Structure 1
C-alpha cells in the first residue's frame, strides 16, 4: 500500500472533490473522524445533540424519514449548527432505484434532501444509472455522494464482485462520488473517503443483524477513515462524553496508522 497521507494533505489532492476537501480540512482542524448517527425521532433531540456534540464530530448523519416532526425549518436550524460547529450533514437515504426515480426522490417531495444534505449515499445494485440520476441534481447543487460498497449487517450480499463494481462506479463518477460506506479500505486512491458503520467500543450486535467492531479495528486494522456511531452514543446517559470517547478512539487509531 502507498504511504498514508494526513487528512489535511488529502484535502489538497489534485483530484479531490470540493465536499471531500471541506470535510478533510475540518477533520484535521478539529481532530475528529467521528460521524454521529443521530438516530432519534424528535427534532428537539436531534438539534440538542447536534449543538452539544457538534464540536466533537466531523459529520452528522440523519434519517429524516424517521423524524416524527420533520419540517424544512428543522433542517435550516440543523444547517446553522453545522456551519457554527463545522460539520457536514449526511442524509443516510440509501437511494436504490432507477436513475429517473432517484433524481426526484433527491430533489423533491416533502424532504427536499438535496437542499440541505452535503452528502447522501446510494446502493449500487441498480447499476450506474442510480449515480447518473442523483448527479443530475447533486452536481448543480455542489453536493457529494457515497456509494455503499460493503454493509455491516449479517448476511450482507455487498461482497466480492459486488464490492468491486461499487469501486469501479465510484472511480467513473468521481465528479460526484466522494467515497464509500464500507467495512474497510476498498479503494487504493486516497481521494476517496471510507466511512464505516457498525461501530461500538464493546463487542456485540443487535437482534436484527447489526454487528459491531471497535474504532481501533475499523480505523487501525481495516484502514477506514471515519467511524459512524449510533446507539453506542445515542443510548448512553451522557452523549457528549460518549462522543468524546469515540472521537479519541478513532483519532488515535488514525494517528497510529499514519505513523
Structure 2
C-alpha cells in the first residue's frame, strides 16, 4: 500500500521538485526540515552548514533577517547544493493573484530566484495559486498549500481544509503538497509537512502548540517535521537536529512496516 520516499519519488504524476526532495530524504535518511528562525545571516549560514547533512530542507523567513542581501542567499544555495537540501521560504503568500506574482518574483527579496519551495494560504481562492504559478512554473519551482495550522484557534479546518486539498489537486503542475497537521490527501504524490513539533509537550504564549515527531509522522501520517525553537533554542543545535531526525525517520520506518 504505502510506498517509501524513494518509490514516491518515481510516481508518474510526481512534481520534479518533490522528486528531488524525496530522493535526498531517502538517500540521507532524513525527513527533518529545519526552521532557521534567526535574525543574523552569519547564524543562518552557520546553522545551514553544520545541520545540512541532517536535514532534507531548510525553511527561511527572509523578512526577519536583519542583514538580508541576495549574496547571503547565494551562499545558502551553495550550502544547499553541497549538503543536499531544498530551500523553502515560509512566506505564506495570501493576497490576490496579481499581487502575489510580484511579491514572489520582485522587490528586494526576489524570492523565486532562490527558493525551491514557497507556501500559500488558500483563503483568497485559487487566484493565489494561479498568480504564483505564472512566476514559479517557468522557474521550475514548487508550492505548498496551507491546509491546517498548528496554532490555537486556527480556522483552517473542515471545509477550509477540503478546499485546500481540492485546490492542490487542481494545480498539480505547481502545487507539490501541504502544510498540515496530518495527512489530508490520499494521493501519494503530495508531500505533507508539519510544523508545531517538539519532543516535549507544550506550546508558547502566542498560540503555538506542540506535538511530537512520533505523533505527527507515526500516528497522523505526515511526511516531514518542521522544527524551529526545539532545535534553535538548544545549546547544541547539531545534536538537537540529530535527535529530531532520528525521531522523524524511525516514526516513518515504523509506519511503513
Q: Aligning the two structures, in what range does the TM-score lie when normalised by the shorter sequence?
A: over 0.9
**CA–CA distance in structure 1, aligned partners of residues 139 and 217 of structure 2:** 31
**Deviation per residue, 1:221-253 (Å, 9 max, x gap):** 000000000000000000000000000000000
Of the three residues 139, 142, 158, the one matched with 1:141 is: 139
| Whole-angstrom CA distance in 2 between matches of 1:79 and 1:114 | 13
**Deviation sequence 1:52-77 (CA, Å, 0-9, x none):** 00000000000000000000000000
Distance 1:143 1:232 in 2: 29
TM-score, normalised to structure 1, is 0.99
TM-score, with length taken from structure 2: 1.00
C-alpha offsets along residues 86-130 of structure 1, whole Å, 9 cap, x if unaligned?
000000000000000000000000000000000000000000000
Q: Distance in 2 between matches of 1:221 and 1:207?
A: 26
Number of positions where the alignment pairs a residue of Structure 1 with one of Structure 2 = 256
Structure 1 vs Structure 2 CA RMSD: 0.1
* Residue in structure 1 matched with residue 73 of structure 2 by the alignment: 75
- Residue 168, structure 1, aligned to residue 166, structure 2: yes
C-alpha separation between the residues in 2 aligned to 1:103 and 1:125? 16
Which of structure 1's runs of 4+ aligned residues deviate more than 4 A? none
Equivalent residue of 1:179, what SS? strand
- What is the CA–CA distance in structure 2 between the aligned matches of 1:144 and 1:29, rounded to whole Å? 21
Cα distance in 2 between the residues matched to 1:25 and 1:118: 15
Question: Could you tell me how far apart the structure 2 residues matched to 1:243 and 1:103 are?
Answer: 34
Give the unaligned 5+ runs of structure 1: none
- Tell me how far apart the structure 1 counterparts of residues 253 and 52 of structure 2 sit (CA, whole Å): 21
